[PDB]
Design a protein around this nucleic acid. Structure first.
Lengths: 97, 94, 105, 78, 104, 91, 83, 98
DNA sequence: ATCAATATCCACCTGCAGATTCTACCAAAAGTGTATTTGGAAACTGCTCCATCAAAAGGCATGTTCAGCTGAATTCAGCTGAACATGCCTTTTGATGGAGCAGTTTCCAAATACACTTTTGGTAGAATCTGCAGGTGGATATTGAT
DNA sequence: ATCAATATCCACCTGCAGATTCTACCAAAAGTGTATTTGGAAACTGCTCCATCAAAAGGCATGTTCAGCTGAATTCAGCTGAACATGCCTTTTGATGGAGCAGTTTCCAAATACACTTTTGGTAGAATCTGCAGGTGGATATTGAT
């Protein structure tokens, strides 16, 4: 059989998704999440299609940048694996907490 | 000459309301004045933006209202909106 | 002649806030309830800070609020800290806080 | 519903972010952060909808809402 | 005989003047201000379109898409400073793998 | 409903007469123009108020560009701007 | 009189005191240079904007409001000098 | 003689400077630095006393907050000594330089 | 190093359809001409408030020594998270078709601007109380050596 | 598990610098009478937005195997903290010249306000076209193994 070493396909994925600009979250689960959250502030709300797409553009962008800062915290602690403490440090430095 | 206003007369009034035994140094009065001017600006300009997004030439107590909702963290917002509506209804009873 | 502040039951100047809304170029025209509502929100927040700051002044055994007590009131209250998160209180100091990792084992 | 954001997608997000290896605890922590994000943004966007006496969140409501949070977004109205 | 042609610009100086009067910025708007501003907006637009067009050529394409714009903003230093807190929808990120993460 | 669409297309034809522009990318340029407009206009407003001036002049727009644009982008901006104002008042 | 090499007046003990109020226990030796680096970039940025206000007001004296407006612009809003 | 162990007076000082609100940079040296940085921008300009005091309040404030973040970056890398590597990370995440 | 056998990447050409670009006529600006209104440049000028100085004194900065203990560098194994082949289902289209509802007018009543003419509440600067800052020495912890 | 060695509480005292109060002004808020416009309040479309509905193709969940990364445990050169001895320079204090901020006027040049005249930018259908997306065929990168 044939098999790639752990780490290789990871870098292949990084090279691919940094090359692309497509959204990476499946659209419908996201839409369900958005209207589920909005229900908690105003009831029976409709959404412009453009607004679900804007909310997803914006949030996926947010998460990718948070992963950059996270990755740097992982590196800084002599690691290669991102952990919850890396996300928690990144947000604490950004001001979000 | 020339005379320059501030909120010190009112900050002092509210200070003797909540803690009638305590006083306030001028450096701290400047900090308070700075706070009233900052929050004034934040509210008035967020309200300005509200009235502009909705093509309305007038800022009403309703614009100020949702500006406060948008801008103050909860509970401070709840209590704020409360005292604001209180004062506006009481006002319009001539 | 009654001041609008008393008509609305406030200590803050409703006339002055109304004047500061026209001269500030926020809107072409200013409704009559806006300066009342706003003067009420400002007076409320001033009260809410002065309360916690006076408390912090009493704790330090002092009868006069200095900038420190204001910083203590802002930083220990979660919501005022959120509201003044990007604001710096001159002569205010920091909250006592030593990371646990650093303490005598 | 929040568990509907599958791990293969959070994987992809970290990939675009430049992440090589991912702890298993990440995915729950990520869903948490994402929820706080939509929570904050939508709360504001809906405050704009209610102020405009509407029942439909418009894309401009999301844009104005994102601007308030310092997440300025281009390509949807401003 | 318009104002934009009088200033030797392509951007609408009349419309910029109307948006300044109607934007609630100041009681009066000087007559040269909308000209000046429309000139600054045209210039910055040119600078971006230039750099993004080069990204379009370099990618073997004729039509500028959002990707070319994001490549133009982030690969240039000063436009990156100016739009550092802006998110370009459909823009992607710049290819960047930390050296620490590379084979051997 | 207005936009900055035809003006961006015009300036595109100056720098790159060969290339064209996607619709989503035109929206992005639109958002960029509106944004920069807002930043400059409101900074100029504050300039006016801070000095108790009642009118926004090119002097204010200029100091706004100095404050907002990371020169060298600012140097070229101030140039392009005074240039267009000079040519405007000539004629 | 000529002004030179003045960042060196930001003493090593004063950078220590600032790190203490910050909650730092141990300080590597290179920090003192790194800190001055950061401090200069901070002051430059602020003073640059502060002076752009002084110049716009056609004045020769940097006022405290000039600094306060400048810090506001940088998202470093300062209370206690502001009027 | 007596001798406190490495770290004890460090913690004595953290406790001391966190309880205070005094400025920690000397007034005259800071004033000289400020006047130099301003001089190399515009020539023979004056400074209101309050504006140097505003610059110093804001600057010590800024640097103390940067040290808090720096320290958490050091702890996060399982250290207790702050290093330049830590400051450069703290600023990078803050956006100040990236 | 390379020899080999996966699999991955990469051009070169390909043909169609979702979008782009270009045409063709209309309200809302925008430019124009005239008449008023006025914001702030210009010009003295009172006068804070800034730069600078002298002098003396003691608070701290500098530099040096010595060693405690931190950070780095190392070895090692358990175990977590990557790569995969598998198997099933939830996301994705794609119109379809009804309907809530964001957008438009059009009267006009209520609310706001506005132009003046009084009527104070606020502010600047005297005057007059009064915290608490910054010494002082006891009691109380807290350290660190034996 | 002790005592010295010091640091850090705290409480107490007391004149002075920084409050608090006591005052006449006067700028601006308030009262009143017209003039303007405001933004709901019903009346009606057209959009876009929900909502089923109904295949296929993906793309997710899931199990198994182990490569190798994360943590832990050691070891140790040496960096950085603690303590000093010295003496520099910041601080404090009080005085003086004068630059230049900021209060007044005065008065054009430049802005606003109408009122028609004129042009342009936006729409919504008509005439192109770049690039996706799919198809081989060839080097490329990767990982096994004498």
């Amino acid at each position: 059989p044939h098999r790639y070493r752990p780490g290789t396909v990871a870098l292949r994925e990084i090279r691919r998704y940094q090359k692309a600009t497509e959204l990476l979250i499946r659209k419908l689960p996201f839409q369900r999440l958005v209207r589920e959250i909005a229900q908690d502030f105003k009831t029976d709300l409709r959404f412009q299609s453009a607004a679900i797409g804007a909310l997803q553009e914006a949030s996926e962008a947010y998460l990718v940048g948070l992963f950059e800062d996270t990755n740097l915290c992982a590196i800084h602690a002599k690691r290669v694996t991102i952990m919850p403490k890396d996300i928690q440090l990144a947000r604490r430095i950004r001001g979000e907490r | 000459r020339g005379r320059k206003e501030s909120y010190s007369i009112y900050v002092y009034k509210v200070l003797k309301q909540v803690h009638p035994d305590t006083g306030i140094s001028s450096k701290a009065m400047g900090i308070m004045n700075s706070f009233v001017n900052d929050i004034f600006e934040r509210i008035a300009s967020e309200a300005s933006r509200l009235a502009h997004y909705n093509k309305r030439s007038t800022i009403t107590s309703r614009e100020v209202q949702t500006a406060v909702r948008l801008l103050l963290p909860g509970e401070l917002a709840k209590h704020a909106v409360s005292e604001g509506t209180k004062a506006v209804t009481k006002y319009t009873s001539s | 002649a009654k001041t609008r502040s008393s008509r609305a039951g406030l200590q803050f100047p409703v006339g002055r806030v109304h004047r500061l809304l026209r001269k500030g170029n926020y809107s072409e025209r200013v409704g009559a309830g806006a300066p009342v509502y706003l003067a009420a929100v400002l007076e409320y927040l001033t009260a809410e800070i002065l309360e916690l700051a006076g408390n912090a002044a009493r704790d330090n055994k002092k009868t006069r609020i200095i900038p420190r007590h204001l910083q203590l009131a802002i930083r220990n209250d979660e919501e005022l800290n959120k509201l003044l998160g990007r604001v710096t209180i001159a002569q205010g100091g920091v909250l006592p806080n030593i990371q646990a990792v650093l303490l005598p084992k | 519903n929040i568990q509907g954001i599958t791990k293969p997608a959070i994987r992809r997000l970290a990939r675009r972010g430049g992440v090589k290896r991912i702890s298993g605890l990440i995915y729950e922590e990520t869903r948490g952060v994402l929820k706080v994000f939509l929570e904050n943004v939508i709360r504001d966007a809906v405050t704009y909808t209610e102020h405009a006496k509407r029942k439909t969140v418009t894309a401009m409501d999301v844009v104005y809402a994102l601007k308030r949070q310092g997440r300025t977004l281009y390509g949807f109205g401003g």
